[PDB]
Amino acid sequence: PSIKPPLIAVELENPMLGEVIDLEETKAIVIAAYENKALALLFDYYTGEIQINRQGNTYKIAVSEDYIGGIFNGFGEPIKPKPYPEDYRDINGLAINPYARKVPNEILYTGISSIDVAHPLLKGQKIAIFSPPGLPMERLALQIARNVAKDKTIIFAAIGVPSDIYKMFIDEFINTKAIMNSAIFISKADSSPIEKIYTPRVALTLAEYLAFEKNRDVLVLMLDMTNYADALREISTLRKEIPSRRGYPAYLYTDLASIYERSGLTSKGSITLIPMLTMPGNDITHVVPDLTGYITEGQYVLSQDLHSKNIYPPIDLLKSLSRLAKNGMSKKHKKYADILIKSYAKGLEARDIATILSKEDKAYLKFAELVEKEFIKQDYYEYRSIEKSFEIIDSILSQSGLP
Amino acid sequence: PSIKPPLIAVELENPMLGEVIDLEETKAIVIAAYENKALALLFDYYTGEIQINRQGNTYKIAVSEDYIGGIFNGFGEPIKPKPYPEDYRDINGLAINPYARKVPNEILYTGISSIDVAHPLLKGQKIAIFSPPGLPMERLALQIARNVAKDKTIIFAAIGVPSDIYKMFIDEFINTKAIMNSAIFISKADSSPIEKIYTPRVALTLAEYLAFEKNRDVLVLMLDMTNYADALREISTLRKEIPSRRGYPAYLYTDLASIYERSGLTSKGSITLIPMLTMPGNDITHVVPDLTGYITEGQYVLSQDLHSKNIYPPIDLLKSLSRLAKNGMSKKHKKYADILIKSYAKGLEARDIATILSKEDKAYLKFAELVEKEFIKQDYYEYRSIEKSFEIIDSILSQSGLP
Amino acid sequence: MNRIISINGPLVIAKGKFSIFEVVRVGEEKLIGEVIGIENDKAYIQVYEDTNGLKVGEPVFNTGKPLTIELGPGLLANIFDGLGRPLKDIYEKTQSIYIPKGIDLPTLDRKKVWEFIPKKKKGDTIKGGDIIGTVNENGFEHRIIVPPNVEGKIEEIYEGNFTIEETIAIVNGKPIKLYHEWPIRKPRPYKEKLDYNYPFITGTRVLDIMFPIAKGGSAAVPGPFGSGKTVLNQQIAKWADSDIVIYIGCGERGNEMTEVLEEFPKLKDPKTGKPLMYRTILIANTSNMPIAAREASIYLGATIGEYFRDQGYSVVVNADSTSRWAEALREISSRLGEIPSEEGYPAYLLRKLAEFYERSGRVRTLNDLEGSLTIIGAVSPPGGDFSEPVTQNTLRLVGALWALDSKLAYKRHYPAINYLISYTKQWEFVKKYFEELYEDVIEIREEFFAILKRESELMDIVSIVALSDNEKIYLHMGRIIREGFLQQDAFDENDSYSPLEKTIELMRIIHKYYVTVKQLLGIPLEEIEQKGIHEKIIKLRYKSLKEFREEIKAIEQEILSL
């Protein structure tokens, strides 16, 4: 009986992987198992001796629509009326058959020109938001959910975020009256690592139920994924195994893939997932945003340079990506994305040069100059149509010197 | 009974951390302790079997003024009359109460313009000397001790230095007739790591006794700190624990802090400490000079560029630092330090540019040009007053084009 | 019965019956420790003192209680350690400048006579966190708050002169003193979490304008040595708009703690006129002091900070530096024989750091009052590399970054706040204050950021020579902003503290200067700078009070380019 919170050692007669053991005033998850020895992670904080009550099951949550309009934690435990129990389900879920899947082809317009035109978001599509520390990434999520989830359920999973982060989401849902059309799961910063990993697992377990069983379109936002990888590494360290790069576990990719892949489009409903992570040291090749980019169907990279130029949203047009974008973009829509990107890329290329060119590279330089000030820059409470976004591009082109 | 010099294994009935065990013709320090098993580090070299004589104490040295005028080793053992024993004291000492401390405000003039003006040394202040391999760092110490310790006791701790290094200090003390006003502790290069770590510990144990108990001002010089960290890492490796960056122990900062903090100013006396370390690969962000800079109240960084320009002392004015400097600098003295540094910084900035400017940046460039040749460059046997150093600055300013 | 079986640095393994987080007395010398782990019949304990000389045949005594601290009058103008022990009394009881191991003395003065003036009456029902009365602690209204657990009516209640150990009132068969014990690892409970309303004035013209935070917020000041982490934080400990200031010297220079004792009673508060020491509480566990007490020092000042927060005041805590705390956690986790994570640090670094930074917050007290705990943490990354665990984990917990750049510290540009990477996620919470009481400040704030931005852009261009006059203007205005607004001598008698009246006027005088130069772009800039007006603006910050007001209306006359 070794006790050092939140990790404990316990003698159990033939334990189970991921088994839930009820204690005096708390619970625990059996993470290790060899013969009659096992290691467990506590849900919160414990102190005294350890009568053990072995359930014989993994952590199962009830599935219903009681969650829609309430605030919960990483376990789905009620913080605000306990949900009806309620058909208990495995929080890990199952692997979705790709044969039954459907490639997203319906674009969800955000009202943001720096998104809709070049790299638009589609219904059911999984796409992340990469952001340097201190940049308005939270506002970027709240602005999206405001406009693409008007007729959808907004499931939000808070991963190891401070009280200033998740309450920024909560208060926004109340002011926009979308609090009752939402479900919030919050794992605190100093909360147990077992709670910071179950948070996106119970939020998607609900998302799969609402979308693919109750036939709905669900928008899921999560933050912070960097804290999630930090929580997983914490458990990987406790469970005596061999770590890898930066102490992170080897199964980091698959574990992050066991979340992002829990989203898509079916003939019944869809799950639009928008993961968010602050790149440690503003490095996109860091072990967390890199593997994330290897899974997510595109990403929205934020720019400190644009942020310093007081540009919201500070989205890098050339670094950002949307793989399934062209599956909803029409022949006219595809034209603007090419014209924008190519001229903006040749514009920034003409920005590094012609400093220390000809009339041609004079226009492209002015193009990228007018794009950041008018096209990219948008008020937080401003909605634009795809036609309006075209009107801006057509206006900028007519001023730069281009056709 | 495992024997592999200088580390041994020994069965002892309830051992003690840091316990001294007398052998046949040598001693040892018990560094590890679990139940009835212990690991020990020999003082020198041993061979045969191991009758053990447990003292029951840590390594304690006698405190007196017999050391003043004699040469010793890392244990304080006589090499030159054994000191009177003599009130044995813990060589580790105790933590000085900051409430009883006094922030140094009395500047000790070195006679060096590249020091006195910009980053002067104060009495009791701890300040280090960073130097690239092969640069006259030893001469920089001997020149300081020559002029700021005329009425003080010069305690010198030699850490893993060759015979050409410490005898450069010894012969200098004899030629300047300061040998009898000094105390020298020498740990050889191939000496035991237990001797290379006790050297600055016994030198300061004496320094604390002379200054804060016998009421004196004591100047302490030590070298090489890089060898000290090398000696500590050696023991940290022998004692089966988890290493860190470059194999160095995790408690490197605290251990280096358990030396530098053993200096300061009290109402009775003061301890002026000048640590010295050769930056491995001429890198100031190396694991040794970095943590040293996090403890020492400033440092004197040497320059290979100036050294190649035949400039002594090759001190970098912009990289060097003295935190408590402004606590002794008058309103007139503070003016020169600002004028010197700012114009020299704008001068070097005008050196990189205007190569491949205007009249303004022409003067600053000439300023930094005349500073290195006249102000920074000083003969090894040349002493300057603070007024004389002002005369140089005022002369350089009147030639560059500045007021 | 209990006995040590293993001694490993600050870690000591004993053999006996122990509970988790239990205070113990190690050896026959009785060294204060705390149980952190349990291995069957054994218990892993960390010692907040030296363990060099302890025997294996030494016992370990129990206490039955957790690590606590005396919360009451007697903390102000005094310096303590990580365990909350008076460094004044230690020097007086031992008559030595050294700190002995195993000296256990009470935090507050036991013989001190306070004058307790009650605010409640006999027969009144009292809850938890309620203010039973006020005590004049050297000009401070120390509102005596009852422990959060007690409840009921007041049987008896007294008034007048008492000591810290005497009963002022008796409630429900239990006496109520002027102080109460509280576990430092257990955060103090509050009613509800309030929203940001008022900005956190620091007195520095960069932490108030460029990157300001709100009251009850959190920040981070990372950077290499020679930057000014200690100097800047002490300035925050000097001129903060706060009722209670706490400075935690975590594993740093002892002289930097002595500096507070010498220069604070001399200076006066720009809000009360009283010495800064009266509103200052020191926690001193230096670098040479026991490494285990570094953690305790963090949990100590945070708890004491919450104590004055529960009273209903403005509390600011400066921890310098958190990198030594992280080193302590690294050291302890290394002795325990656990798998290291990134850069040698333990895996639960972010979690432990979250146990401190989350204590900050403008909250509703247990007596329906508005308290505020603003936490400013200092980080010391190796080689000035911000891409490190301690820094990167803190960045995902705080609301702003106050990074110290080496290049600025190289040319002696203090404070060396890197006005490019540094940020603030609490600007939209504090923008209402400045806009309401000073219309044109966000107009100029963006302008200041723009000038500093393009100057950085043109700085990659300056490595060639030969520029447009519309480009040379930013190089000119950039010099004015840096030297005459960003730079702030902390040792100058009149530039150390800068009120908003002085700060905004500097923002106004540069804006008034900027709109003039842009209009003259039709004459060369060389003639504009020939007047030497820009140099007169730089010298503004070094001016006193009345002299500063007069030069402003002197430059405005020189502004007239008619």
XYZ file of C-alpha atoms in Angstrom, chain A:
403
model
C 0.000 0.000 0.000
C 2.158 2.842 -1.316
C 0.605 6.308 -1.097
C 1.949 9.375 -2.891
C -0.895 11.433 -4.470
C -2.232 11.110 -6.980
C -0.446 7.818 -7.716
C -0.947 4.796 -5.455
C 0.070 1.134 -5.319
C -2.480 -1.539 -4.433
C -2.690 -5.329 -4.108
C -5.667 -6.586 -6.120
C -6.727 -10.142 -6.967
C -6.438 -10.170 -10.771
C -6.918 -6.439 -11.551
C -8.235 -4.828 -14.737
C -6.719 -2.219 -17.055
C -8.576 1.055 -16.542
C -10.600 -0.417 -13.686
C -12.473 1.996 -11.423
C -11.996 1.448 -7.693
C -14.263 3.258 -5.233
C -12.539 4.485 -2.080
C -13.849 6.207 1.051
C -14.596 9.620 -0.457
C -13.019 9.322 -3.910
C -12.360 7.071 -6.906
C -9.322 5.820 -8.833
C -8.275 4.370 -12.195
C -6.135 1.226 -12.291
C -3.512 2.087 -14.910
C -1.007 -0.718 -14.290
C -1.477 -4.467 -13.844
C 1.030 -7.245 -13.151
C -0.148 -10.396 -11.355
C -1.724 -9.231 -8.096
C -0.092 -5.793 -8.121
C -1.546 -2.611 -9.619
C -1.062 1.159 -9.802
C -3.948 3.634 -9.666
C -4.579 7.336 -10.292
C -6.896 9.188 -7.912
C -9.671 11.445 -9.218
C -8.879 14.199 -6.721
C -7.057 14.276 -3.380
C -6.944 11.569 -0.705
C -5.166 11.161 2.639
C -6.006 8.330 5.028
C -6.068 4.539 4.875
C -7.227 2.385 1.959
C -11.657 -0.579 2.234
C -11.482 -0.947 -1.547
C -14.611 -1.292 -3.685
C -13.735 -2.792 -7.071
C -16.441 -2.105 -9.658
C -15.092 -4.372 -12.385
C -15.634 -1.822 -15.142
C -13.862 1.009 -16.933
C -15.077 4.551 -16.295
C -18.518 4.669 -17.894
C -20.733 7.735 -18.262
C -24.476 7.912 -18.889
C -25.603 9.139 -22.308
C -28.483 11.603 -22.641
C -29.334 15.212 -23.475
C -29.233 16.266 -19.826
C -25.675 17.484 -20.383
C -26.898 20.018 -22.942
C -27.078 23.185 -20.854
C -24.908 22.256 -17.888
C -21.351 22.646 -16.622
C -19.315 19.547 -15.770
C -15.734 18.471 -15.109
C -13.337 15.951 -16.634
C -15.426 13.065 -15.327
C -18.788 14.446 -16.415
C -19.716 14.917 -12.765
C -22.376 17.620 -12.200
C -21.164 21.024 -11.003
C -24.189 23.149 -11.890
C -28.707 18.350 -11.358
C -27.207 14.902 -11.946
C -27.873 13.552 -15.464
C -30.187 10.558 -15.895
C -28.293 7.235 -15.543
C -28.896 6.618 -18.230
C -27.202 3.871 -20.253
C -23.541 3.785 -19.213
C -21.052 3.877 -22.096
C -17.302 3.395 -22.507
C -15.743 6.869 -22.537
C -13.055 5.633 -24.930
C -15.733 4.705 -27.458
C -15.009 2.710 -30.607
C -13.175 3.143 -33.909
C -15.447 4.563 -36.609
C -15.638 2.459 -39.772
C -14.281 4.499 -42.723
C -16.645 2.587 -45.022
C -19.574 4.140 -43.162
C -17.910 7.562 -43.136
C -18.627 10.435 -45.515
C -16.064 12.987 -46.688
C -17.256 16.478 -45.607
C -18.450 18.621 -48.519
C -20.598 21.258 -46.813
C -18.732 24.435 -45.852
C -19.671 26.138 -42.584
C -19.124 29.860 -43.158
C -17.484 31.595 -40.196
C -17.920 35.161 -41.415
C -14.156 35.592 -41.306
C -12.507 36.533 -44.606
C -9.144 35.093 -43.551
C -10.897 31.731 -43.203
C -13.915 31.403 -45.520
C -12.074 32.335 -48.724
C -8.710 30.563 -48.543
C -9.119 27.771 -45.982
C -12.848 27.394 -45.178
C -14.271 25.108 -42.488
C -16.566 22.246 -43.487
C -19.235 20.482 -41.431
C -17.748 17.501 -39.609
C -14.207 18.497 -40.553
C -11.535 18.352 -37.852
C -9.286 21.422 -37.862
C -6.961 22.855 -35.210
C -5.841 26.342 -34.195
C -2.111 26.845 -33.662
C -1.261 29.967 -31.671
C 1.790 31.606 -30.062
C 1.451 32.211 -26.288
C -0.678 35.248 -25.452
C -2.426 35.564 -28.812
C -6.250 35.796 -29.082
C -6.865 32.117 -29.821
C -9.789 31.901 -27.403
C -11.568 34.776 -29.144
C -10.991 33.036 -32.475
C -12.879 30.009 -31.150
C -15.705 32.029 -29.609
C -16.158 33.952 -32.858
C -16.373 30.734 -34.876
C -18.823 28.994 -32.535
C -20.942 32.151 -32.582
C -21.595 31.875 -36.312
C -21.319 28.199 -37.286
C -23.207 26.743 -34.319
C -26.400 28.806 -34.438
C -28.397 25.624 -35.028
C -25.952 23.203 -33.408
C -24.909 21.859 -30.004
C -21.686 23.377 -28.667
C -19.729 20.848 -26.608
C -16.680 22.424 -24.966
C -13.867 20.553 -23.219
C -11.560 22.583 -20.977
C -8.153 20.949 -20.533
C -5.959 22.233 -17.700
C -7.012 25.826 -18.313
C -6.920 28.664 -15.735
C -10.102 30.277 -14.392
C -9.628 33.153 -16.842
C -9.738 30.856 -19.872
C -12.841 28.683 -19.496
C -14.933 31.458 -17.931
C -14.132 33.485 -21.038
C -16.000 30.741 -22.893
C -18.768 30.473 -20.293
C -19.576 34.189 -20.102
C -19.597 34.351 -23.901
C -22.175 31.553 -24.042
C -24.364 33.445 -21.570
C -24.120 36.785 -23.379
C -24.884 35.111 -26.710
C -27.619 33.031 -25.053
C -25.956 29.821 -26.244
C -25.378 28.500 -22.723
C -28.456 26.259 -22.911
C -27.381 25.098 -26.368
C -24.009 23.984 -25.019
C -22.255 21.414 -22.832
C -19.111 22.296 -20.887
C -16.524 19.978 -19.323
C -13.795 21.656 -17.278
C -10.577 20.144 -15.943
C -8.773 22.658 -13.729
C -5.067 23.486 -13.978
C -4.111 21.826 -10.687
C -6.590 18.996 -11.259
C -5.553 15.337 -11.472
C -3.975 14.153 -14.760
C -6.636 11.429 -14.947
C -9.202 14.236 -15.110
C -7.268 16.208 -17.723
C -7.248 13.230 -20.099
C -10.836 12.052 -19.640
C -12.169 15.538 -20.408
C -11.987 15.327 -24.210
C -12.916 11.639 -23.973
C -16.235 12.248 -22.210
C -16.986 15.312 -24.335
C -16.700 13.253 -27.516
C -18.517 10.289 -25.980
C -21.404 12.725 -25.619
C -20.707 14.166 -29.071
C -20.890 10.724 -30.682
C -24.183 10.089 -28.890
C -25.769 13.408 -29.858
C -24.593 13.415 -33.472
C -24.453 9.795 -34.632
C -27.263 8.365 -32.500
C -29.619 11.279 -31.838
C -29.000 12.627 -35.352
C -27.509 16.087 -34.787
C -24.742 18.417 -35.932
C -22.315 19.062 -33.077
C -19.486 21.593 -32.838
C -16.770 20.579 -30.377
C -14.089 22.956 -29.093
C -11.183 21.900 -26.872
C -8.327 23.636 -25.045
C -5.658 23.215 -24.104
C -4.256 20.280 -26.082
C -0.764 21.195 -24.884
C -2.003 20.573 -21.346
C -3.533 17.288 -22.491
C -0.175 16.069 -23.793
C 1.312 17.352 -20.542
C -1.235 15.322 -18.582
C -0.598 12.185 -20.633
C 3.160 12.560 -20.193
C 2.557 12.840 -16.451
C 0.822 9.453 -16.388
C 3.383 7.930 -18.755
C 6.034 9.010 -16.258
C 4.199 7.600 -13.236
C 3.661 4.295 -15.030
C 7.274 3.120 -15.196
C 7.851 3.022 -18.946
C 10.462 4.398 -21.341
C 9.791 8.029 -22.346
C 10.859 9.698 -25.598
C 11.378 13.229 -26.915
C 11.000 15.855 -24.169
C 9.880 13.108 -21.787
C 6.703 12.566 -23.801
C 5.376 9.004 -24.279
C 5.875 7.141 -27.560
C 2.135 6.646 -28.063
C 1.538 10.406 -28.203
C 0.452 10.317 -31.850
C -2.048 7.480 -31.425
C -3.442 9.006 -28.230
C -3.991 12.349 -29.964
C -5.409 10.348 -32.862
C -7.832 8.656 -30.472
C -9.495 12.058 -30.116
C -9.324 13.867 -33.454
C -10.557 10.771 -35.300
C -13.609 10.781 -33.030
C -15.216 13.277 -35.410
C -16.521 13.436 -38.970
C -19.674 13.144 -41.057
C -22.278 10.377 -41.169
C -25.667 10.102 -42.900
C -27.274 10.767 -39.511
C -25.198 13.637 -38.140
C -21.760 15.232 -37.914
C -19.071 16.297 -35.445
C -17.140 19.490 -36.169
C -14.039 19.455 -33.967
C -11.733 22.420 -33.371
C -8.741 21.520 -31.159
C -6.568 24.347 -29.832
C -2.976 24.388 -28.603
C -0.398 27.026 -27.692
C 2.838 26.126 -29.479
C 5.584 25.990 -26.803
C 8.090 28.691 -27.733
C 6.132 29.586 -30.871
C 7.547 26.563 -32.694
C 5.305 24.678 -35.121
C 7.775 21.786 -35.300
C 7.423 21.204 -31.555
C 6.422 17.673 -30.518
C 2.813 18.717 -29.836
C 1.720 20.898 -32.780
C 3.652 18.685 -35.215
C 1.844 15.417 -34.496
C -1.390 17.408 -34.311
C -0.786 18.620 -37.857
C -0.248 15.000 -38.866
C -3.784 14.164 -37.731
C -5.990 17.252 -38.056
C -7.376 17.991 -41.522
C -5.637 21.366 -41.604
C -4.874 24.105 -39.083
C -5.107 27.843 -38.402
C -1.652 29.210 -37.587
C -1.574 32.540 -35.744
C 1.072 35.205 -36.359
C 2.936 37.288 -33.778
C 4.003 39.649 -36.557
C 0.383 40.346 -37.481
C -0.517 40.492 -33.789
C 2.162 43.144 -33.294
C 0.600 44.981 -36.235
C -2.656 44.944 -34.252
C -4.325 42.544 -36.689
C -7.251 40.360 -35.639
C -7.469 37.601 -36.397
C -3.651 37.310 -36.652
C -3.995 34.318 -38.985
C -1.119 33.447 -41.312
C -2.725 32.881 -44.718
C 0.260 30.966 -46.094
C 0.885 28.759 -43.051
C -2.775 27.922 -42.425
C -4.273 24.835 -44.057
C -7.593 23.161 -44.840
C -7.330 19.820 -46.633
C -11.015 19.165 -47.314
C -11.581 22.813 -48.259
C -11.739 22.254 -52.024
C -14.529 19.707 -51.503
C -17.024 22.503 -50.892
C -15.423 25.366 -52.800
C -17.105 26.053 -56.143
C -15.324 26.865 -59.408
C -15.712 30.561 -58.606
C -14.686 30.093 -54.974
C -11.542 28.205 -55.992
C -10.517 31.146 -58.181
C -10.417 33.631 -55.297
C -8.408 31.274 -53.081
C -5.776 30.900 -55.801
C -5.684 34.615 -56.635
C -5.449 35.567 -52.956
C -2.773 33.081 -51.873
C -0.539 33.281 -54.960
C -0.523 37.087 -55.042
C -0.085 37.286 -51.266
C 2.774 34.783 -51.428
C 4.394 36.714 -54.273
C 3.681 39.873 -52.293
C 5.515 38.777 -49.157
C 8.255 37.507 -51.457
C 8.373 41.050 -52.822
C 8.427 42.350 -49.247
C 11.699 40.689 -48.249
C 13.158 41.935 -51.526
C 12.768 45.571 -52.648
C 13.893 46.676 -49.168
C 17.675 46.708 -49.056
C 11.726 46.194 -57.695
C 9.783 46.591 -60.942
C 6.187 47.713 -61.488
C 5.043 44.084 -61.389
C 6.455 43.334 -57.935
C 5.304 46.801 -56.872
C 1.669 45.748 -57.240
C 2.010 42.423 -55.418
C 3.774 44.204 -52.557
C 0.880 46.658 -52.325
C -1.538 43.727 -52.556
C -0.169 41.966 -49.473
C -0.036 45.399 -47.844
C -3.762 45.961 -48.391
C -4.669 42.356 -47.567
C -3.364 42.518 -43.995
C -4.965 45.908 -43.315
C -8.393 45.253 -44.832
C -8.928 41.585 -45.699
C -7.212 39.824 -42.788
C -7.985 42.497 -40.192
C -11.538 42.103 -38.886
C -13.458 43.343 -35.845
C -14.309 40.704 -33.232
C -17.996 41.559 -33.611
C -18.040 41.742 -37.409
C -19.637 39.149 -39.690
C -18.890 39.022 -43.417
C -20.559 37.148 -46.265
C -18.567 35.204 -48.850
C -19.721 37.770 -51.415
C -18.555 40.629 -49.184
C -15.183 38.898 -48.872
C -15.042 38.785 -52.669
C -15.867 42.497 -52.799
C -12.823 43.197 -50.634
C -10.497 41.097 -52.798
C -11.850 42.620 -56.014
C -11.339 46.077 -54.500
C -7.774 45.375 -53.368
C -6.884 43.962 -56.790
C -8.219 47.125 -58.438
C -5.927 49.288 -56.295
C -2.670 47.322 -56.384
C -2.268 47.437 -60.158
C -3.445 43.890 -60.785
C -6.500 42.999 -62.907
